[PDB]
């Protein structure tokens, strides 16, 4: 069987070996990276069914990230299977500042009264909490009395009951017992802090990433089309127009402007962590279903991500609720699922990938009977639409082992992908950028080949590759779809059903 | 603007000129056929939408029929358009014998008692009626007391009330006021007169016909598959495998065995004349609809025939009932309509064709909304069915001006024909037998061309021909369907939607 | 076994006995109506499936029509079954005037040149034709050069090639060999002769008719809603609100304004005679199907009329084309079929009815599989529509022998009628006007009974009547539908499936 | 809005107050129960939307359980809303024995070798583990070499590599690092230990429960129909035939025999805990979907249960994966969801109920567009089926606020429940057993009322109750469904749509 649902695995130290020393062993950070040993460990993740690696630019300097990408390049060589490179921007993050006296955290109780400091550069005390705002913004005038400041995944709330113009501070009340640790996430819902469309740090992060060579960018805290287009401008400036941009919907502004953001972007990442704090917690499953449906209708790529298998950071087997969650992400019709901590810094990086894939394959057995995605709802008054519909009805009506595309831009592959055929899709292409850019599209198995001389040659090549890759043998039925001639920039116009000789 | 429903026109004297004298004028039969001027009259029928000519071998010797076929051959050259040649067998006909004293007809009254003579060779009297049974069969032992002998289209009935073994005669009672003319048809329902599967006259008629060159044969009074296969054997023997056989369903045995007859034959002719006498009169519309449905499901050709525009034999304009009748034949999904008397020996042969075509085109504008044929009912587990389904859905979903196919055997053209696309079907072929054999298939325009070297050449040829024939112009969308490669004996597997340059 | 399609039979002399003498026998017109023996003949029509009688006020004075209505009243008492009374208006008819010298008809040839006289009161000559225009209108100023004057069912055409202002005449050319007899119909297509919305003769005809007691009125040559409302006003004035008005669509203005006419009227009569002359002949089947569809969607009654079984005027058995025509009227979803000449002044009035019913019952066995009416197309946002839908689905899903309704206004019966259930509809009512007014609605069997005291009593009455009428026996399933309470003016809201005890 | 999805809450100490002392405070078990104070706390759970309480007979003696049920009886009085009483059997549980020297647990490492003791009565050592098998069964001959013994929720595995016939012990290897605590669950998959269909302890538990008064029984570890029928026998013996039996599918034998078990039982409980250990972990979501679908098709009740909101035992807010899991249980079309530990012994009993309900209401907003259950797939050739389908289509086609049933046995309520109307269902009934037995049926709001005298009275009562309960006001549309007359034992036959006056 072929895992049709794509996997994004966040890379980190959990895979990286230093002087024969694994993550957790003391003075690990002291020793230097063994590139060969980690690449061998990364190769086991690729084999486990990871399709793309995520470089989270919230943590790690350019040296750290760029070296990691160099290791993956060699890991591809060991496994002999390519994968996509995804960069994740820090964006307008707010964190709790460091504590005076190397205090790591403090405990509070409900009813307690404390202050939050809007001044930048200063350290935290138990009595006053200093915020690290990205790009050193003053947020004093942008958060009002009665607003809510949340710390460590929204687990601890502080209600703003007064502002002091004298010190530019917020007087807050502790809503529940909890811990305020240093370097923890801060969220302030139902606010519009005037963060730039593009902050200078994120410009640098992307430019550094584009220089190393990336296939994707996930833009954090996308509020509007403007935020996506400011990144698009850089990609086109640097001669990286092939880079596909995922808007991360992390907040209410993102949901309100979802329609214009989906138009602007090449896909969406459902960022459930930040989203769960910013909107009612019991409403995240509603937005997850709605968002996947609309992105699919735009023919674009959706990633369901964050806390998919949270517990496997610490424990070898997931909870029944995590397994259910990953299971229904496939049944809503997500293109891709994402491991963040599980693969970056947990104790079970390879098992988390193996757990996620096995669930992904089991759900795809139930897609036919239970799948929430419907191809019938789509418009059918255009040549591409009737041609895709005919391919899907083929796979519906017969035992079709494989749909085989020859695609210059990969357009045909995204078209058939969108219709969710009851078959694996071979996407044959003529350049590596197009090959690696198709890695997150549902059911699509990208393969590099030589351009065809003619339509008959095209049909020869398609059968020859699928047979050589071992995907089909004699007696198996395949569908061959293309914009003929493939060399010219024409959209899908041709379909051929072939019994493999 | 392209008549999708085919027209079968019965040929006869009505078009034939003799010493410059039209049929009806004084001593016409004396003078010889002015072939050239006759062919001009047949040419105008073709130009007015006739697609096939019927040679009814019930009337006319071989010299008469063979001459007529020669005239049509020259008529196509005048028109510069080809048509199919259909032979209709006499079959197991019963007729009233000639009258003593050159009397033409006799009048009877209800309650009158008379006799019917089973002896062959003898003449008719007013008081005793002699039957001309095909091949001089004795029917005394095959007709029972209480059976019913019908004369002149079942307009006059005679009940058998007694048999006389001495004279081998039937004592009959006249059941309604009516005329018994000489040479009128005789029908006996609910009987099994043991006529041979193939009678010696019909073997010779077909052999003569096959020698001249015919594309179709209509077998009269088909009771069983056996009757069809006896004719099939001759076609195989003589090297005429390409000849397509229509079973004429003219009787109860034919209705009961319709399923095995449809398997045996290449299509059906609904013979409403004989059928109306043999079955309840008010049940003819039930059998017409049922038969069309089943023949379509077998992918074969159905012809609705007899009294389609009866009154246009005598009068320039048809009745509103006749216009209705031809109209609903198209809406039940007949491949073809047939004029018998209107074109063979009527006063308005050309007007009958013109009236029939205009009705045919009007009905075809209502086929989409009101058509009683449903292509969704068909099985869809095979590559021909999914490929035809995709062609039909294309024409459903877009403005498709033309479906174009390249077919060696014509299989693809019959396949798309069966699915009744909302488009004209250009069927490009490589031999005249295949061209002429496609002439009765719904919506199919057969055209001869050269075989394609390659699949891309195939796509070039299809667009080039449809543009040259004036069927499509620049900007128009076409579908191209084929079994690739066209030279190999493989069924339909390839579909291309092409914007005509 | 219950004829669902209603029959309208035109009454006339063909059934009327005079001094024991049938119509046709010597000096028939001299002798007086033997009412009792005539009523016996009308009784056998009702028994053979006539549901309504048509009094055509084009021919016959008030004395003649009023006597006929009296005979039908006594005919129902002989049959012990009731029927509806339909009056047909003369309307803006044009006829050829009487000939000088008691000449009955004259023969012309193509290319002949003659004149048509616009003066009123004058007689016809062979060389000059005088028109009898209803209400003595001058049509000289309302007909243009190049227009076409048709005589005897549009069988003979005269082209207006010149006008003479001096004599106020049209110079015409005979366009085909044909007869101009006296008292024959005259038609001028593509004209707006300014006939009044309601002419004084038709006001008096209706007033006379309403006085006798009629259930329906067919308004001839309806051009607009205005023409229908002028008649509506009289029905309201005279306390005859219950009279249901059928617009006869006889012309182009009627076709164009069909939408506003269907809103104004209680149903439509498809008048194929006049319509065939006024519109292209081969377009009559298009308008018949379209009109039936729209009238059904308005929940109203459609009657397909004229030349349904033409030949049975002269001959005992119809043509196969006529049987086809009446057959497809039922399959297009006509509520009723109408014999005009066949029952009014033909040799086979009772046989015509018997032939028509037998065809009607045969077609109704094919309505489920082939019926071109679709009740799924109807809007479903209201409680009547969901309630009717549920009744139709009940009859679809189970063997429902009968639908039984109790209706004060008859609204529920028209509702279920509109949805064309696969069941007979017993409509129990509380007054004769409502009983007789339901007689032309498809599948509805009107029966008088006593109002119910309660909903449970309603369910008792419905089962008791259907058992007593012999429509259902023990073990049979029925559906009971009503607007509860039946006494209150409320639309259908209640449905009960009952196994008959 | 009305929570349509039912909630089962497991009751326990977390709600019970002892000498003003809550669970966790030391020497709590010492003090006696305050009945009034706990009932006040249980009343807040009922208000929070708990519909049924589960008494888990694995933990607590008869004194403890029977007192708890007495408290709930008073809690109903405080809240003034009734709930169902569900008893859960211990069944063939295997637990780890107590440890010598009051050792609470021991730590092992992979590769370690230890023995498992099949002798009963004996205590545990670190070197030898003693099993507490229900009813003191010898399992030595029923578990084979190569089998797998799992402890604490299958988190620690021991592979059987040898059997010692001398001591009747299993030689085992530790598969993973883990803890073996005392009184922890033991599972041995792919074994058929010959536990009785009914063990003497479970007979006593049920008989004690039936005496106190229960509405439901959940039978643990159902393998076959036989296991369900042995409990059915007791219910009928004791005059408790109204008690509804849920088979808990906890094992492979249960899944293999699911069809015969669903026939035998009144519903199913998906017991995900035991099931997750007994079958592949990644396959629990597959069995959850399949099981819900089949139970629905049988018209029976399904409960999705175990670890629905696990983390809320310790923490005030659930994980995003738990919220997703509870969300998709509603979207698969579960009748009911279940809290076990969360409500029995966690720190957040009332918040767990409130969390579960809020999720349940949010999912039911998405049931219309995304619901996996389909009413169209059901048979429709029976009176009840067409009547339910008509009710569902009503709610589909209009804004129906409420479906109102009057039901003697509650049959009509289960019928409409099964079709999952887009409306709340008032189930009006005449006895408390029927009222409390309907509490776990999806969307059903049970209410006691007086029997109706007549059908009209029935329609009065239905509107009057729904208006008095505040469920509908003037202008709101309701559907009233019943087997008329309601007093007689007849299945559903009547439907009425009423605008609330
Ligand atoms: Mg985030
Ligand atoms: Mg014949
Ligand atoms: Mg008229
Ligand atoms: Mg369990």
* Per-position DSSP letters for C293-313, written without gaps between them: HHHHHTT-EEEEESSTTGGGG
Residue with tokens 């490589």: B430
Residue with tokens 């009731």: C82
B272: left (phi over 0), alpha (psi -120 to 50) or beta: alpha
Distance, in Å, from the CA atom of C146 to the CA atom of D154, rounded to the nearest integer, reads 99
Distance, in Å, from the CA atom of B137 to the CA atom of D494, rounded to the nearest integer, reads 68
Task: Name the minimum distance, in Å, from the CA of A396 to any CA of chain B.
Answer: 9
Pairing of strands A400-406, A477-482: parallel
Is residue D251 within 8 Å of D260, Cβ to Cβ?
Answer: no
Q: What is the CATH number of domain A6-90+196-368?
A: 3.20.20.60
CA angle B170, B173, B176 (to 5 degrees): 135
Distance, in Å, from the CA atom of D444 to the CA atom of A15, rounded to the nearest integer, reads 53
Q: Which CATH architecture has domain B6-91+197-368?
A: Alpha-Beta Barrel (3.20)
Chain C residues within an 8 Å CB radius of B360:
none
Distance, in Å, from the CA atom of D354 to the CA atom of A362, rounded to the nearest integer, reads 32
**Which H or E element spans position A428?**
strand A424-429
Pairing of strands A169-174, A113-117: antiparallel
Distance, in Å, from the CA atom of D415 to the CA atom of D407, rounded to the nearest integer, reads 11
D84, D413, D432 from D472: Cα distances, Å: 25, 19, 24
Q: Topology of B94-187 in CATH?
A: M1 Pyruvate Kinase; Domain 3 (2.40.33)
Residue C162: how many other CB atoms lie within 10 Å? 12
Residue C501: how many other CB atoms lie within 10 Å? 7
Q: What is the CATH number of domain C383-499?
A: 3.40.1380.20
Closest CA to A123 of A150, A102, A141, A94: A102
Is residue C371 within 8 Å of C354, Cβ to Cβ?
Answer: no
Distance, in Å, from the CA atom of C251 to the CA atom of C195, rounded to the nearest integer, reads 14
| The token pair that represents B286 in the structure block | 């039930």
The ligand that comes nearest to the alpha carbon of residue B57 is 2
Is residue D249 within 8 Å of D261, Cβ to Cβ?
Answer: yes
Pairing of strands A128-133, A94-96: antiparallel
Instruction: Judge A/C contact: 3 or more CB pairs < 8 A.
Output: no
CA of A248 to the centre of ligand 1 (A): 8
Strands (E), B377-485: 400-406, 424-429, 444-448, 477-482
Chain D residues within an 8 Å CB radius of C398:
381-383, 386
Cβ separation A289–D370 shorter than 8 A: yes
Distance, in Å, from the CA atom of D307 to the CA atom of D313, rounded to the nearest integer, reads 10
Q: Where are the domains of chain D?
A: 9-91+197-366, 94-187, 383-499
Length of chain A: 501
Cβ separation D386–C394 shorter than 8 A: yes
Q: How far is CA D364 from the centre of its chain?
A: 20
Is residue C403 within 8 Å of C479, Cβ to Cβ?
Answer: yes
* Core vs surface per residue A129-140: b (16+ CB within 10 A) or e: bbbbbbeebebb
Is residue C429 within 8 Å of C435, Cβ to Cβ?
Answer: yes
> Does residue C39 sit in helix, strand or coil?
helix
Q: How far is CA D138 from the centre of its chain?
A: 31
- Backbone gaps in chain D, preceding residues (C–N over 2.5 A): none
* Residues from D in contact with A at Cβ < 8 Å: 155, 176, 272-273, 276, 281-286, 288-289, 306-308, 310, 316-325, 327-328, 331, 355, 358-359, 362-363, 365-366, 370, 372
Residue with tokens 């669970």: D23
Chain B residues within an 8 Å CB radius of A412:
none
> Does residue D366 sit in helix, strand or coil?
coil
Chain D residues within an 8 Å CB radius of C493:
496-498
- Domain D9-91+197-366 belongs in CATH node 3.30.420.10: no
Q: Which residues contact B409 (CB under 8 A, 6 or more apart)?
A: B434, B489
Residue with tokens 């005890």: C501
Tell me whether the omega of the peptide bond preceding residue C384 falls within 30 degrees of 0, making it cis: no
Residue with tokens 């809103």: C263
Closest CA to A115 of A181, A173, A179: A173
DSSP letters along C431-461, please?
SHHHHHHTTTSTTEEEEE-PPPSSHHHHHHH
Q: Which residues contact B369 (CB under 8 A, 6 or more apart)?
A: none
Does A412 belong to an annotated binding site? yes
Any chains having at least 3 CB pairs less than 8 A from chain C are B, D
* Number of helices and strands in chain B (H, E): 16, 22
Is residue D193 within 8 Å of D142, Cβ to Cβ?
Answer: yes
Instruction: Report helix angle A383-397 to A411-418, nearest 10.
Output: 60
Closest chain C CA to residue B276: C320
Does C38 belong to an annotated binding site? no
DSSP letters along D368-393, please?
HHH----STTS--SSHHHHHHHHHHH
Is residue A427 within 8 Å of A405, Cβ to Cβ?
Answer: yes
Closest CA to A226 of A261, A275, A179: A261
Instruction: Measure CB to CB from residue D362 to each of A286, A325, A359 and give the nearest one.
Output: A286
Cβ separation B393–A386 shorter than 8 A: yes
Residue C171: how many other CB atoms lie within 10 Å? 17
Is residue A139 within 8 Å of A222, Cβ to Cβ?
Answer: no
> Does residue B185 sit in helix, strand or coil?
strand
Q: Which residues pair with C219 in a beta bridge?
A: C247
Is residue B255 within 8 Å of B224, Cβ to Cβ?
Answer: no
Q: How many CA atoms lie within 13 A of C135 on its CB side?
A: 18
Cβ separation C390–D390 shorter than 8 A: yes
Cβ separation C366–B308 shorter than 8 A: no
Ligand 3 ion: residues within 5 Å (CB) = C 250, 271, 274
CA of C274 to the centre of ligand 3 (A): 5
Chain A residues within an 8 Å CB radius of D272:
320
Phi (first) and psi of residue B420, to 5 degrees: 55, 55
Distance, in Å, from the CA atom of D31 to the CA atom of D35, rounded to the nearest integer, reads 12
Instruction: Measure CB to CB from residue D319 to each of A286, A288, A321 and give the nearest one.
Output: A321
> Does residue C56 sit in helix, strand or coil?
strand
**Which H or E element spans position A56?**
strand A52-56
Q: Which residues pair with B389 in a beta bridge?
A: none
The ligand that comes nearest to the alpha carbon of residue D307 is 4
Cβ separation A494–B493 shorter than 8 A: no
Residue with tokens 């492979």: D252
Does A56 belong to an annotated binding site? yes
Best of A250, A304, A327 to disrupt the D interface by mutation (most D CBs within 10 Å)?
A327
Instruction: Judge D/A contact: 3 or more CB pairs < 8 A.
Output: yes
Question: Which positions of C are catalytic?
Answer: 54, 95, 248, 306
Closest CA to D456 of C452, C498, C449: C452
Alpha helices (runs of H) in A61-179, residue ranges in sequence order = 62-79
Q: Which residues pair with C336 in a beta bridge?
A: C6, C303
Sign of CA dihedral C323, C326, C330, C336: negative
| The token pair that represents B390 in the structure block | 């995709």
Is residue A132 within 8 Å of A96, Cβ to Cβ?
Answer: yes
Phi (first) and psi of residue D131, to 5 degrees: -95, 135
Q: What is the CATH number of domain C197-301?
A: 3.20.20.60
Phi (first) and psi of residue A174, to 5 degrees: -75, 120
Closest CA to C318 of C353, C364, C282: C353
């Amino acid at each position: 069987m072929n895992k049709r649902v794509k996997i994004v695995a966040t890379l980190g130290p959990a895979v990286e070996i230093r002087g024969g020393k694994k993550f957790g062993e003391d003075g690990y950070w002291g020793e230097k990276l063994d590139v060969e040993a980690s690449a061998k460990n990364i190769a086991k993740l690729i084999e486990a069914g990871a399709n793309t690696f995520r470089f989270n630019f919230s943590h790690g300097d350019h040296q750290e990230q760029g070296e990691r990408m160099a290791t993956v390049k060699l890991a591809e060589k060991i496994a002999g299977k390519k994968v996509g490179f995804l960069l994740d921007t820090k964006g307008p993050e707010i964190r709790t500042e460091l504590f005076e006296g190397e205090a790591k955290e403090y405990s509070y109780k409900t009813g307690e009264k404390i202050r939050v400091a809007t001044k930048q550069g200063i350290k935290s005390t138990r009595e006053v909490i200093a915020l690290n705002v990205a790009g050193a913004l003053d947020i004093y005038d942008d958060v009002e009395v009665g607003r809510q400041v949340l710390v460590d995944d929204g687990k601890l709330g502080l209600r703003v009951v007064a502002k002091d113009d004298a010190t530019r501070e917020f007087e807050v009340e502790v809503e529940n017992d909890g811990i305020i640790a240093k370097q923890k996430g801060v969220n302030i819902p139902n606010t519009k802090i005037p963060f730039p469309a593009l902050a200078e740090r994120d410009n640098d992060d992307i430019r550094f990433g584009l220089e190393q060579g990336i296939n994707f960018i996930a833009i954090s805290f996308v509020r509007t089309a403007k935020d996506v287009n400011e990144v698009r401008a850089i990609c086109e400036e640097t001669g990286n127009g092939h880079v596909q941009l995922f808007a991360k919907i992390e907040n209410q502004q993102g949901i309100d402007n979802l329609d214009e953001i989906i138009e602007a972007a090449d896909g969406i990442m459902i960022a459930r962590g930040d989203m769960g704090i910013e909107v009612p917690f019991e409403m995240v499953p509603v937005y997850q279903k709605m968002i996947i449906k609309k992105v699919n209708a735009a023919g674009k790529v959706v990633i369901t991500a964050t806390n998919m298998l949270e517990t496997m950071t610490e424990k070898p087997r997931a909870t029944r609720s995590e397994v259910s969650d990953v299971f229904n992400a496939v049944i809503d019709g997500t293109d891709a699922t994402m491991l963040s901590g599980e693969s970056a810094n947990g104790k079970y990086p390879l098992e988390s990938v193996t757990t996620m894939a096995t669930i992904d394959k089991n759900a795809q057995a139930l897609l036919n009977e239970y799948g929430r995605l419907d191809s019938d709802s789509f418009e059918r008054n255009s040549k591409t639409e009737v041609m895709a519909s005919a391919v899907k009805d083929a796979t519906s009506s017969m035992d079709i082992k494989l749909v085989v595309t020859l695609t210059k831009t990969g357009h045909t592959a995204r078209l058939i992908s969108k219709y969710r055929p009851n078959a694996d899709i071979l996407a044959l292409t003529f350049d590596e950028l197009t090959e690696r850019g198709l890695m997150l599209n549902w059911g699509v198995i990208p393969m590099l080949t030589d351009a065809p001389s003619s339509t008959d040659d095209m049909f020869e090549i398609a059968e020859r590759k699928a047979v050589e890759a071992g995907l089909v043998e004699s007696g198996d039925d395949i569908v061959i779809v293309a914009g003929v001639p493939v060399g010219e920039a024409v959209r899908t116009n041709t379909m051929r059903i072939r019994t493999v000789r």
